Design a protein around this ligand. Structure first.
Ligand SMILES: NC(=O)C1=CN([C@@H]2O[C@H](COP(=O)(O)OP(=O)(O)OC[C@@H]3O[C@@H](n4cnc5c(N)ncnc54)[C@H](OP(=O)(O)O)[C@@H]3O)[C@@H](O)[C@H]2O)C=CC1
Length: 456
């Protein structure tokens, strides 16, 4: 079936480094003052035991690229840089993407490019990813580093080493494989180190649900960005599925363009539709919105399509910039999560993107918000709550390998994902023979080592 050929998911498979062959030269360890000291010591011994001189690089939160550029031009020749900025980092209230490590990672990268160090950067994160459903993502925002990290790898390979996640508060794994990781020939740049081995991130095709389970829309279904392109198609799908009542929300709401014939089109399909103006970044507006739902038709599902798009390059991106532009997607999701955590929802669907699934040049500023969604969904599942972060491909990078999918087909793939209870399904139509060549044009990857069509 066409739908079953658009389904993919992320898995972590056991793998190896490829012989450490020791190191040489001087490595820098970037960290904040009085933070990640235990891990820094574990990293130092790991690197020094491999035959390298380690020096610390104490970074001041949100210092900027200019300051780091001057300091990197004084250290002299550098063999590599290990970033521990995301280690022992507290979650940022109010704005999750205001993470200092996100802003400073970008600053470090840009600075490394300016100082022309000519060496790769390796970023360590703590419990930022889950190798299995039994592991919990500690801070969903840390996922943004992996998201933007993937794009930086494609735009400036020479300066990007990779990403390594280790158990929060733990150092044993790091000081045990770090050496082999930074000096490996496997080409693994996306790894998770656990007490029971090393794992590598991999794309794999998803299986069909032989289960009788079939998600069905009941009561009221809320769709953010309902008046937008994607939210509109989702609404049409729900109506065709037999959804009783649809609540479409956006900042424009009833004033949105095309909203008029939108309701008429949905009501024609047999669904009572209501369009309301609501800014999902405003927690109070959302609370009032939810509170206005008829007791006769309780909210049962949420589809969060609200968002914005850009196209800036990594050298033009700043943590502040990213945080500000991804508010509807990120804050909208957080608010909806907090305000429905008590409701009896059957589905809570966040609209993620291929931008975070594998990332692409120019999408560096878009990847962060989508990665956060992936993490939030996994956190909800860990707490016994429903959630699905669907990484969407293009909806009908054309010749880049990704083929736009028909609205109808895309929604049936999602239906199938809800039926199998997949937390982070990837729904995209691509031609691997064309995609792979472009994705590894200047940088190889093992991300697609299990994709049949990637080996065929
Ligand atoms: N952009 C692209 O080319 C692609 C995007 N995607 C995916 O599809 C998703 C949906 O976007 P799309 O369908 O293009 O929609 P649109 O491009 O039409 O944008 C919809 C607009 O959505 C609503 N909105 C924005 N911010 C808020 C907010 N703070 N509160 C409430 N609603 C808000 C608004 O409606 P109003 O005007 O009424 O205020 C807003 O003007 C993306 O986020 C992404 O995951 C997939 C392939 C390509």
């Amino acid at each position: 079936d066409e739908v079953s050929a658009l389904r993919y998911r992320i898995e972590w498979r056991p793998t190896g480094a490829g012989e450490p062959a020791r190191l040489d030269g001087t490595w820098l360890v970037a960290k904040y003052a009085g933070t990640a000291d235990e891990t820094s010591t574990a990293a130092r011994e790991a690197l020094e035991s491999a035959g390298a001189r380690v020096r610390e690089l104490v970074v001041d939160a949100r210092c900027g690229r200019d300051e780091l550029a001057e300091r990197l031009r004084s250290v002299g020749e550098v063999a590599g840089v290990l970033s521990l900025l995301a280690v022992d980092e507290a979650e940022p209230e109010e704005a999750p993407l205001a993470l200092a490590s996100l802003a400073d990672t970008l600053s470090l990268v840009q600075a490394m490019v300016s100082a022309e160090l000519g060496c790769p950067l390796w970023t360590v994160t703590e419990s930022a990813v889950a190798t299995g459903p039994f592991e919990r993502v500690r801070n969903a925002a840390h996922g943004a580093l992996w998201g933007v990290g993937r794009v930086i790898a494609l735009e400036n390979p020479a300066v990007w080493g990779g990403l390594v996640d280790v158990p929060a508060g733990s150092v044993a794994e790091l000081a045990r494989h770090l050496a082999a990781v930074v000096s490996g020939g496997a080409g693994e740049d996306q790894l998770a180190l656990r007490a029971d081995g090393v794992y590598g991130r991999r794309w794999v095709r998803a299986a069909a649900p032989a289960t009788d389970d079939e998600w069905k829309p009941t009561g009221t279904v809320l769709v953010t960005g309902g008046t937008g392109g994607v939210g509109g198609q989702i609404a049409r799908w729900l109506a065709r599925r037999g959804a009783p009542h649809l609540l479409l929300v956006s900042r424009s709401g009833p004033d949105a363009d095309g909203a008029g014939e939108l309701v008429a089109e949905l009501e024609a399909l047999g669904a009572r539709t209501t369009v309301a103006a609501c800014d999902v970044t405003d927690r109070e507006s959302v609370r009032e919105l939810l509170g206005g739902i008829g007791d006769d038709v309780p909210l049962s599902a949420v589809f969060h399509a609200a968002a914005t798009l850009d196209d800036g390059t990594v050298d033009t991106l700043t943590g502040e910039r990213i945080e500000r532009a991804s508010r509807a997607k990120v804050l909208g999701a957080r608010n909806l999560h907090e305000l429905t955590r008590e409701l009896d929802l059957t589905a809570f669907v966040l609209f993620s993107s291929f931008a975070s699934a594998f990332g692409a040049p120019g999408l560096g500023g878009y990847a962060p918000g989508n990665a956060y969604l992936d993490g939030l969904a996994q956190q909800r599942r860990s707490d016994g709550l429903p959630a699905t972060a669907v990484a969407w491909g293009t909806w009908a990078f054309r010749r880049h390998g990704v083929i736009e999918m028909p609205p109808e087909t895309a929604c049936r793939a999602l239906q199938n994902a809800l039926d199998r209870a997949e937390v982070c399904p990837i729904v995209i139509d691509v031609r691997w023979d064309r995609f792979l060549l472009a994705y590894t044009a200047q940088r190889p990857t093992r991300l697609f080592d299990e994709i049949d069509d990637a080996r065929r």
